[PDB]
RNA sequence: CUUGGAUUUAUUGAAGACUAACUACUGCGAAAGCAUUUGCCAAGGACGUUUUCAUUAAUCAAGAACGAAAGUUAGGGGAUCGAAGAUGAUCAGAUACCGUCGUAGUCUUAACCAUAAACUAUGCCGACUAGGGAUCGGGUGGUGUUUUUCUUAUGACCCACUCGGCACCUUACGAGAAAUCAAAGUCUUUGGGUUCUGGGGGGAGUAUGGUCGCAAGGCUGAAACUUAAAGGAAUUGACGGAA
């Protein structure tokens with residue numbers, strides 16, 4: 001018989017400044033007892049929350065953002081966009097029968113040692129006028145589109161040191177660019193980033209992290 | 215098309231429609247488009263389905279890109295028929 | 297025994313032998329053609345419960361999303377309950393989507 | 397103002413969970429299940445039990461100090477069903493009734509890309 | 524079955540699997556078969572062609588190439604399901620379902636094997652006969668529409684025709700025992716060109732010999748003897764723990 005609910009400590013989740021709010025909500029942990037410390041325990045906590053939660057508007061209620069706790073500074077805990085996400089119920093509605101979808105995965109080392117995997121879904125358009133029930137692009141065309149997308153990703157990830165990339169992603173500029181690139185091959189609908197996954201990461205880079213929050 | 219077609223003389227439209235083979239007599243509908251390049255004032259009797267990167271008589275101008283059927287006449291180029 | 301149908305498993309024609317799919321209910325391996333692919337687009341909340349949710353909730357309008365399950369049924373299984381619906385010989389020829 | 401949680405309703409066939417957590421996920425609040433509130437083996441996924449569980453969870457939350465939740469629903473997933481159970485909806489209803497507030501509802505059932513082999517065998521499950 | 528938080532919650536790691544959604548009376552391949560990525564490596568049909576050779580052509584007993592799954596030997600892995608096996612109910616009983624678990628495998632890599640409701644239960648090549656729309660892949664024409672970076676020019680449709688494969692309705696005068704069939708038609712008004720197979724049912728895919736295999740089995744293949752039906756298609760019934 002112990003009951004650790006009384007033996008608890010509440011802390012506040014501190015988001016990056018690329019969004020509107022720099023505060024997500026409220027997590028908790030046990031106290032910093034001898035042998036097993038609190039800060040250490042914290043550093044490595046992924047808060048997956050909605051993007052409409054951060055941005056406020058319901059245009060970004062089609063998105064999610066995994067936020068990894070890095071630095072614990074004065075109760076409040078600083079996080080980093082560990083991932084970007086779509087919940088299932090968003091992309092599932094976009095996948096409809098009688099039109100081809102185009103996924104595109106791209107591995108990219110940013111300027112910093114941060115290997116980002118960035119995805120890109122893009123559906124094919126039922127044109128204006130169309131009586132062909134289907135709107136299927138030719139396999140070759142699809143391939144070309146994918147290639148283009150990859151190229152775009154290479155151009156705009158790698159460049160701009162990862163923080164800026166996230167910002168860019170935020171209001172669908174990349175998606176727009178992709179769409180533009182496509183239009184000569186095939187029209188397309190929607191076009192999104194869907195996910196952002198992450199592989200490598202260097203030393204914590206504390207000063208740099210701080211330079212986000214100010 | 216039913217009973218009494220009278221088959222020696224069709225209307226030409228029908229012939230045009232049907233395959234270049236499946237008329238009365240075999241007769242192709244490819245043409246020797248007499249192309250002029252923008253450069254030199256000389257006429258190249260270019261067959262409309264080239265199958266080749268069609269150069270001029272000597273100069274490397276490039277007249278027609280051989281698409282699977284009829285050739286796309288590269289850039290703003292002018293041509294006569296047959 | 298004569299042919300009940302021309303098609304039978306249907307989509308397989310000029311298609312040697314296709315890949316298969318597992319049934320939802322039975323987990324019987326059924327070819328993805330002799331399959332009966334009903335699409336369950338249910339709302340994430342129950343009809344009467346929606347009101348309750350609204351009463352509870354924060355924000356306006358809300359996501360109120362739909363779950364999406366393309367369900368595959370092993371023919372026999374489908375016949376027990378699902379869209380199948382045993383027809384007359386003359387009525388089998390009709391492929392138009394029912395109701396509507 | 398509104399202190400949040402993530403509800404997490406694992407609504408399988410033959411049992412429901414209600415597993416309220418913090419936003420990171422690690423630190424839980426209440427894990428209350430269907431079979432816990434009704435000792436009848438059969439009556440686990442059964443709605444009433446689920447509702448009871450939900451109520452219990454709500455109570456726990458109140459005791460702790462939380463105001464709102466984010467509904468996440470998980471059907472068994474992958475090798476099984478992919479179909480929300482009988483008592484997820486019921487649980488949700490119960491939660492709503494409780495007055496514990498609600499925001500951003502999702503179904504995060506782990507629907508795979510191409511599962512590793514399912515139940516039954518090839519001839520399936522033959523009652 | 525654990526609680527000395529298993530499950531559940533969250534980050535990983537390892538492994539070998541698979542490759543959903545997409546996904547259709549859709550596409551390719553000689554079939555078997557083939558759906559994430561990019562790349563490489565060759566090949567291929569269709570097309571288009573006022574290109575070139577000039578009978579090289581069609582089908583095939585000998586022989587050849589492939590060939591699902593399982594099995595096999597020998598290697599890697601093994602998540603789940605899961606012949607074997609344990610085991611919990613039920614019934615007069617039930618080593619059967621259902622139930623829980625779960626070696627072999629399943630998956631793969633190196634060898635075999637060479638069989639299938641490998642089924643379109645429809646050999647191939649050729650010609651001709653009746654309407655219709657679509658649908659994939661080529662290719663023509665549209666002062667057609669939109670893209671818009673001004674004319675654009677690609678692209679993407681619209682429409683008409685065109686050739687091409689994996690696809691409805693009526694009458695059939697053609698057919699067919701009929702289900703049905705636009706081929707299963709142009710057959711007693713019997714002959715376009717070819718290969719292969721069958722001759723009541725059983726005995727029997729057995730016996731035997733050959734041959735092929737590591738085996739399991741394969742290809743090949745009887746008779747004695749037995750028997751009046753065996754089948755097919757449908758019609759009306761009766762019935763069905765079908766609707």
Ligand SMILES: [Mg+2]
Nearest residue numbers: 297298299300
């Ligand atoms: Mg029958």
Ligand SMILES: [Mg+2]
Nearest residue numbers: 297298644754
């Ligand atoms: Mg028979």
Ligand SMILES: [Mg+2]
Nearest residue numbers: 310311688689
């Ligand atoms: Mg074919």
Ligand SMILES: [Mg+2]
Nearest residue numbers: 311312313641
């Ligand atoms: Mg086959």
Ligand SMILES: [Mg+2]
Nearest residue numbers: 136139549550
């Ligand atoms: Mg295709």
Ligand SMILES: [Mg+2]
Nearest residue numbers: 509543545559
């Ligand atoms: Mg895929």
Ligand SMILES: [Mg+2]
Nearest residue numbers: 584585586587
């Ligand atoms: Mg032979």
Ligand SMILES: [Mg+2]
Nearest residue numbers: 592593594629
């Ligand atoms: Mg095998």
Ligand SMILES: [Mg+2]
Nearest residue numbers: 516517605625
């Ligand atoms: Mg079993």
Ligand SMILES: [Mg+2]
Nearest residue numbers: 610611612618
């Ligand atoms: Mg027993």
Ligand SMILES: [Mg+2]
Nearest residue numbers: 722723724725
């Ligand atoms: Mg006999």
Ligand SMILES: [Mg+2]
Nearest residue numbers: 297755756757
């Ligand atoms: Mg009969």
Ligand SMILES: [Zn+2]
Nearest residue numbers: 254270272273
């Ligand atoms: Zn010249």
Ligand SMILES: [Zn+2]
Nearest residue numbers: 319322370373
């Ligand atoms: Zn089933």
